[PDB]
């Protein structure tokens, strides 16, 4: 064999979100990756990380540069907090170049903070010449695949109209004292529209094989400060500020057949009492399809899947861990394409094979900027050349 | 002391009055007995009049002798919206001639245009007579109890809200039988003014608010639609539809600034897996909900479901096979009639429990579909708040 060597950016084997999915993922495909590399800030908790869990290869390195420079690193891994990734990804790319080995660039999502630092990002990792992925693990939950093998073989055929509603967890109306305040401040790569919408809306033009043609959004912070609450859910009668939305009304069309397109998605807490928190409802001419799932995290959640002298059929993984098994799937993918299972490429697009790179990561953004921007000149806005230049 | 009806649209064969209003009137006899009956051809009236026993009816040669008359206490327009202008301004104008009108009844929608509407209510207005607009939708058992839990505070403030709706007629197949008028733009009818308009003022109403802000999308994906006959076969020839066959709206609650998402669908195949019409309203002590299989609010026998008490009880309230395309209508008359008998003439309803929609309610209403339709046009949100007001 041939273990892709991993060096991880981000894998804090106690907090964090990497040691929840990534870790556990690698680990179930012990012969094809393996852990190598591990840069931290402070060099003490590499160590203390490679420690806890007895990682027989992880090497702690002191320096971002003797990280990145190294040549036992085949696939580098960046799993920090969004805010630092445009600090830390740029002279990363940069000392790589003395990694003749390097064939791996793996970022989690949101890829930044901003379409300007996505679209550097972007530029400096195509010229540097390495294979991109982004964690878009939408794209490999078994629900969504056969969701789209389904629409892709005409079986509910044409699409009529198609309607999203999602969750995005942590903005409702009260916050954990617990819960760090930078994902409640702007500017931080981290909120509703960006993460929780981008995975969603990114899940659909996949399944549907069709980017957007015309868009309008509404973006709120009707819930400008949070009441703090403690373990039970008792209130501290303190209240701290957010400036991140707290509610998005996405609207449009599919470029493919001018699909209308309704969403929306929901802050946070109370949750819907008579309604699944995510649901994709898409109505076809010759049958329905929709996705229901009780986390609003669809990357992450565990749906049930419903498509339509007629014959009805649900679908459902019983005890399928998809936090995990997403992410294991993603890996599993770029494994396959590695020892050539089943050339280097730029972007999935809406290809079955493959994975989403950096690329698929940018457009993304691109829609993403096009939603706060319409909210803000209260415009519907044309997007269809969004997905070239 | 019985309300004297003057009826312009009652085709006991044929039409919508005749399965709605005619019921309804029958189920109150002491208070409203049908008198006048005009029609286009005079020959219409007799026929009518002689199917169903009417007792009272009189059938009238002329527009100008019917309006004229002084057997009429309330003119009930039932016909087509497309003749709803050139039928009500003159009419208007020869029921001078009758001191005892106390009561204008008109269909919604009220007219084809914003500029139509605007001009009847103005004509209605100066007559000075009590105008009333078939918006039921304010009268469902199920709108009611809606708008009562969520003006007691029971459903606390709202955060969020999602509409669902089937126009019914607009999908991809016509039946031969259908008349091809409620598929020619510029007739009154149609996806966005008629099934939206009546779904999208019920929440207006059940929630006490107007809008602020919105944003719509309208669209011809289906410009021709599939003639198919009764069985539900194709005669393999298809036929123009200029009418909207999708709406996308989208705005804000002029109260709380609470998001509204919307989405109506043309009409078949329906929805297999989620109820055809559906009000998702989300609050922050519980939520609320009205499901139905019609896609019509005004005209269906809908499911309440409501949680809230926060050890948290949730309930569900049907009535079991109650009529709603009677009922609600019903229910109008038996407000007029409370109204008039008193168990003070009265501009517009509002958000108000008592009295009943008017025609300046359904003018506020033509200037949201307006906008709607304006939104579409110019693809940018509007900004729509003062649209409740200016005496323009």
Redesign the interface.
Known sequence: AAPIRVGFVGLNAAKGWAIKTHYPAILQLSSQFQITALYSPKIETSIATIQRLKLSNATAFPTLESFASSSTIDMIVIAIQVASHYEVVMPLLEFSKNNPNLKYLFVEWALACSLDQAESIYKAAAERGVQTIISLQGRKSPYILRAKELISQGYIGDI??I?I?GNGGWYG?ERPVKSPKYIYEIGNGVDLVTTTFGHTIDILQYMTSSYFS?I?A?V?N?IPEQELIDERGNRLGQRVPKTVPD?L?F???LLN????????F?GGK?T????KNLVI?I?G?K??L?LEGDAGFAEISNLVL?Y?K?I?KVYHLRNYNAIVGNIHRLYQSISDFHFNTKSQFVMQGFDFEGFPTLMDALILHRLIESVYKSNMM???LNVSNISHY
């Not at 057949?257 to 929306?264: A, T």
């Not at 819907?272 to 309604?275: G, P």
């Open positions: 009529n109209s309607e509603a109306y015309r309008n509404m709120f009707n509610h009304l609207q449009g069309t057949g001018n699909v209308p397109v309704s969403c929306s929901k109370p819907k009492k008579f309604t409802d109505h001419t049958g329905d929709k419903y339509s007629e009805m209260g415009s519907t």
